RNA sequence: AGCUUGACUGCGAGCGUGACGGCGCGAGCAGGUGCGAAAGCAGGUCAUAGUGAUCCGGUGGUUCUGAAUGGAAGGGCCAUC
RNA sequence: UUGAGCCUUGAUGUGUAGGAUAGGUGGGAGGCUUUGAAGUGUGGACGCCAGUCUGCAUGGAGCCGACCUUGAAAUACCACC
RNA sequence: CGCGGGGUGGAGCAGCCUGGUAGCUCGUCGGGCUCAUAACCCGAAGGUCGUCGGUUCAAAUCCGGCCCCCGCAACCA
């Protein structure tokens, strides 16, 4: 395989997990990782280090595709949404832009917090 | 049965093979005994038993 | 660089997709070699034989009117005065118990080995190094025989061994471009009919489509 | 225990019984072997159940046959499941 | 357009082990190259991190082997696939 | 009376348009470590590549026998 050296990173963060996908700007996927699939369960995948292992694990999927300079698309409220990026920089990657692309539903479905007690 | 019929080759290279009933697939012991031949009628070594 | 000097001195002597005959091809092969030394002629040809079928494996020997195109060193293993008689008949050296040292180490300065059945024990226990080198005496081709003083005379009859490898390629040295054209013709015509006699009783498509000859200088030519 | 494979081979004077198909008993010769010092002996086990004719198809050999004639297919015969 | 296929083009081999990167493979002490290559290092490309290529550090016609020696097979000079 | 995919520590399965690395892993056996059992984490024990051949120093990677498995009266005349 020949190096492609360009792409876009799709990052999603929840209260207990951090998800990363790498794509070419055609919309086509080339690698994935999560703070859980990084070999962690329970709240061990909520750690600021599991968000680093997810970045280095997605970088292990594109190491032969040669991608190191990219732009980021961010989803979701989770605190890992910056802990994975401050670590991605320390892992040797160049970040050009970061855009928050989280949607805003006009209600529809009731918020999953419930309780109702 | 499971013992089954088997034919032997000869050291003379005969087209005629000698028949016996003997196991090969679960209890092989082989056979070499010499017997009468149909080509010069003075016996040949039947051997190996596959 | 990198097309070597002795190949640049022979520009515009070959054209692609061209047909020949032996008398036309050997006159060109003599014209591609410009070297000061005496150079050899080597055949390398592809046969229509399938690698999955055991009855299509091609290997043995033959006697040709000029052999491989050179004299050969013949060694003979036997006992008593008949070793000197065989040396006179057509052999360069007697096969000794001391000669097994050069055999087992693979540093042999000979081309053909003949044995008497009472001396065969000196080389039969070395078939692991004689066999793959094309030097092994075998009772099924008369190179292990009590009449060594006729077998060494046949070892001077122009003996050529043949063996195919993967994809059905086969290789033989057949002459020199310093030879007369009728001499180089008769030895090539004899190799081709010895190889047509060697055709298996089942072959894939056309068994032998062309015959190719080279010296490696300016590359080879087909007939 | 040692040797040995006669669990051979071509033929057979004749005899006993069953409605038939079928089944039992056997002198002696011919070819080639083995045991034994030799005399002498062996044509599978100590003997009574371990089992189908035929049709058909497969399979080694064979001018025995073979539809104009010469090969060939198919059949016959010797082998054989 | 695409599973399978074909004519046409361009470069190939460390899966281990080294002293060492032996594609398979047939011959082989005399031969290629000769204003350019040799080699181990920071820099540049790549990397199996061993080195392959490049300017420099640098040199200026070699390079190479037989004895010895790893290996089933060898390490110039070069076919066949 | 006949065919080709599979056969790789006790089971399951990669290894295979380079011919040698014995591998992924489940179980089995034993330790770190939390309140504690398992997860986790550190490790150990055991391979006739079905079984013999061809070409060979060499065949899991290609082939050919012999065997077993396979949707199935392989044909039973």
UniProtKB/Swiss-Prot annotation, chain A:
GO terms for molecular function: small ribosomal subunit rRNA binding; structural constituent of ribosome. Pfam families: Ribosomal_S11. Keywords: Methylation, Ribonucleoprotein, Ribosomal protein, RNA-binding, rRNA-binding. SUPFAM superfamilies: Translational machinery components. It comes from the Bacteria. The keyword tRNA processing does not apply. The keyword rRNA-binding applies. One of its GO terms (biological process) is cytoplasmic translation. One of its GO terms (cellular component) is cytosolic small ribosomal subunit. Part of the 30S ribosomal subunit. Interacts with proteins uS7 and bS18. Cross-links to IF-3. In stalled ribosomes contacts ribosome rescue factor SmrB. Belongs to the universal ribosomal protein uS11 family. Has been predicted to contact the N-terminal domain of IF-3 based on footprint studies; exactly how IF-3 interacts with the 30S subunit is controversial. NCBIfam families: PRK05309.1, uS11_bact. Located on the platform of the 30S subunit, it bridges several disparate RNA helices of the 16S rRNA. Forms part of the Shine-Dalgarno cleft in the 70S ribosome. PANTHER family: 40S RIBOSOMAL PROTEIN S14/30S RIBOSOMAL PROTEIN S11. This is Small ribosomal subunit protein uS11. It comes from Escherichia coli (strain K12). The lineage of its organism: Bacteria, Pseudomonadati, Pseudomonadota, Gammaproteobacteria, Enterobacterales.
Swiss-Prot record, chain B:
It comes from the Bacteria. One of its GO terms (cellular component) is cytosol. Keywords: Methylation, Ribonucleoprotein, Ribosomal protein, RNA-binding, tRNA-binding. PROSITE patterns: RIBOSOMAL_L33. Pfam families: Ribosomal_L33. The keyword tRNA-binding applies. One of its GO terms (molecular function) is structural constituent of ribosome. NCBIfam families: PRK00595.1, rpmG_bact. Surface exposed on the 50S subunit. Belongs to the bacterial ribosomal protein bL33 family. Part of the 50S ribosomal subunit. Cross-links to the P and E site tRNAs. This is Large ribosomal subunit protein bL33. The lineage of its organism: Bacteria, Pseudomonadati, Pseudomonadota, Gammaproteobacteria, Enterobacterales. The gene is rpmG.
Swiss-Prot record, chain C:
Coiled coil: none annotated. It holds the Pfam family Ribosomal_L1. It comes from Escherichia coli (strain K12). SUPFAM superfamilies: Ribosomal protein L1. This is Large ribosomal subunit protein uL1. Part of the 50S ribosomal subunit. Cross-links to the P and E site tRNAs. InterPro entries: Ribosom_uL1_bac-type, Ribosomal_uL1, Ribosomal_uL1-like, Ribosomal_uL1/biogenesis, Ribosomal_uL1_3-a/b-sand, Ribosomal_uL1_CS. HAMAP family: Ribosomal_uL1_B. One of its GO terms (biological process) is ribosomal large subunit assembly. Keywords: Repressor, Ribonucleoprotein, Ribosomal protein, RNA-binding, rRNA-binding, Translation regulation, tRNA-binding. One of its GO terms (cellular component) is cytosol. GO terms for molecular function: rRNA binding; structural constituent of ribosome; tRNA binding. NCBIfam families: rplA_bact. The keyword tRNA-binding applies. The gene is rplA. One of the primary rRNA binding proteins, it binds very close to the 3'-end of the 23S rRNA. Forms part of the L1 stalk. It is often not seen in high-resolution crystal structures, but can be seen in cryo_EM and 3D reconstruction models. These indicate that the distal end of the stalk moves by approximately 20 angstroms. This stalk movement is thought to be coupled to movement of deacylated tRNA into and out of the E site, and thus to participate in tRNA translocation. Contacts the P and E site tRNAs. Protein L1 is also a translational repressor protein, it controls the translation of the L11 operon by binding to its mRNA. The keyword Oxidoreductase does not apply. Belongs to the universal ribosomal protein uL1 family. The modification N6-succinyllysine is found at residues 104, 153, 185, 196.
